[PDB]
Every structure is written in structure tokens, then in C-alpha cells.
Amino acid sequence: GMKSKILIFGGTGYIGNHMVKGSLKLGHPTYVFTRPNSSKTTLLDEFQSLGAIIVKGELDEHEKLVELMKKVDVVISALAFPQILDQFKILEAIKVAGNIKRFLPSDFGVEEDRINALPPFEALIERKRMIRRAIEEANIPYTYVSANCFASYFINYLLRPYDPKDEITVYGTGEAKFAMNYEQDIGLYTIKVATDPRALNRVVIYRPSTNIITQLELISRWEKKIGKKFKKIHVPEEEIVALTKELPEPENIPIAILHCLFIDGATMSYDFKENDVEASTLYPELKFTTIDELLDIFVHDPPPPASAAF
Ligand SMILES: NC(=O)C1=CN([C@@H]2O[C@H](COP(=O)(O)OP(=O)(O)OC[C@H]3O[C@@H](n4cnc5c(N)ncnc54)[C@H](OP(=O)(O)O)[C@@H]3O)[C@@H](O)[C@H]2O)C=CC1
């Protein structure tokens, strides 16, 4: 009906698939752009059975992109770090088509315009800032989503729940706060804000009050959930910093990210600005899965671990 048509790049991705599923659940005609040689064949079949329109192609196909843009209203990019500047290909098509009502670039993490990180990671988020500046320069309607930490991703990373080891690594003092959200919810809320006028040309942050915690508190709550105690092994902050200067790329990137999220506490180091929009306050019919509910999911049916591409 009146539902805006949504085009998603990287829809077969770790976070992208939750955006495709959320879009279809909400009744939006959904277009998924995917490479001709992608191995996400079974996933695409699932998307298709759910009503998605699959479009195979390369980002280098400028004409194809423009013709596709003319058929949709909203564009969401969930491309990975290695492809951040390749989003300029998407932006160029958006500009030529001229009918796009909202563009959401691939942010979905820290709020890069108000925080800084160690060189390995700083260089990467600067690429995301470059996309934002180009969007603003061209007056393209947008929504910048700071999703904070992907919960399943980092619960797996920090707790290694599938590992019967008796020790757990703690980065720094472990007292830094961070916010983490369930991937499925990040996907659903992202589709919602993409058409919500309250999110037009604004920074939307996902920071539900039930999802703020420290490494030490997460470990304590997990121990209670499974009835086991762990020996906490700390890696001093000055030690983490050294690694980012010697460990080569891409090995030093994850380390730099860990420092940003869990030592500097970048997702919780600032107060909201006048024009910021915290998403959990937007829809009374919805709510973010809480940390306790997340731990229950890991007890009953834990999702597999993942490693981002760098
Ligand atoms: N906040 C957090 O905790 C985290 C944030 N992130 C962020 O989420 C966003 C997406 O990350 P993530 O979901 O891990 O991305 P993925 O690594 O899952 O990649 C997304 C999609 O990109 C497409 N793709 C891969 N390589 C290429 C290429 N060479 N050319 C064109 N398309 C390509 C693939 O789709 P196909 O095969 O269909 O072409 C792929 O499924 C990023 O901005 C990332 O920084 C990610 C992890 C954690």
C-alpha cells in the first residue's frame, strides 16, 4: 500500500539480514542487493520465501543502481568496514536518481562524530564520517544510527559461552560501562526509524536503560545464570595500547575496538544532545530485549559467534 519501498545493501550480512527480516515483518516491499557470486544462496532463498525481491549485481554497475533507486523510496546500507568508501557508489546513484526519501549509511556502532579511538580504529570510523559529510554536503535526507554494541556478537566475544574454560579475560579494570543491543531488535528498530519523521536528518542512538552494563557485572550475572565461577584474568590498559602499535593490521583493529568499547567506554562516555533521539523512547508497542533476556537466550538457545571483516 502506502508502505515505503526499501532497498538494502549488504542485506545478507551479519546485521543486514535482521534489517531485511524486520522490513518484511513490517510489511515494506523489500529489495535486497547482493553480489552474483555471494555464498549466501540459502539465505537469499529464505528472503525470497518471505517476500523479498532479490537483485543480483555489483556496486560498480552505476546504471543498474540508478534504475533501481528510481523504483524505491528508502535506502539502507549494511556494508562491512572494507566497503565503507564503496558507499560513494551508492551515494552517486542516489544523487542521480533524485527520488530517495531517506538514506541510512552503514554506521550501526559508536557515535563517531562525538568520540575518538586509537589509530587502528580511528582510521576506520573516519571513513564513516567521510560518508556522513558527503551526505550532508549533498543535502541527502538521512538518519545516522548509533546502535552501540551488537549483543550476541559481544556476549560471544567476552564470555565465550561455548567454551568450557575456567577463566575469563577482562580488558582493563572492567569497570567501564557499555550498552549492547540484540541484533534482531537493531534490525527492527532501524527499519522503523527509517520512515519515522522524528528521525529525519537526525542521529538516533540505541541506548535502552536495561542494556547498560560493565564487563565485571556481565560476568557476575552470567556466573549466576549457569552456576559456575570463573577466574578473572585482566589485561591492563597500557598493555592493550601497546598491542595496537606493534600488532600489525588487521590484527590490531579488534584490539583497538576493545579498548574503545570496554576501556574508554565510548558507548556510554557522553550525555545526550538536544537533537539526539534515543530509540527506545519512540514506540510504546515495542521494547529492546534486555540483558537478562539475552543471557536467558544464551542459556537456552545460544546464537553462534561471529567475527567482523577488516
Ligand atoms: N556495533 C557492533 O557491535 C558492530 C558493528 N558492525 C557494523 O555493522 C555494519 C555491517 O557489518 P557486518 O554485518 O559484519 O557486515 P558483513 O561482513 O556481514 O558484510 C555485509 C555484506 O557485504 C557484502 N559484501 C562483502 N564483501 C563485499 C565486496 N567486496 N563488495 C560488495 N559487497 C560485499 C556481502 O553481501 P553479499 O554476499 O550479498 O554481496 C555481505 O553479506 C558495519 O558498519 C560494521 O562496522 C559489525 C560488527 C559489530
Numbering used by the authors: 5 to 314
Question: What does the literature reporting this entry say, word for word?
Answer:
The basil EGS and petunia IGS are closely related to a number of other NADPH-dependent enzymes that act on phenylpropanoid-derived substrates. Structurally, the PIP-family proteins organize around an N-terminal, Rossman-fold domain, containing a core, six-stranded parallel β-sheet flanked on each face by an α-helical layer. In summary, a mechanistic scheme emerges in which binding of the coniferyl acetate substrate within the active site of EGS leads to deprotonation of the p-hydroxy group (PUSH) coupled with expulsion of acetate ion from the C1 substituent (PULL).
The structures of EGS complexed with NADP+ or NADPH provide the first structural characterization of nicotinamide-cofactor binding by the PIP family of enzymes (previous crystallographic analyses had yielded only apo-enzyme structures).
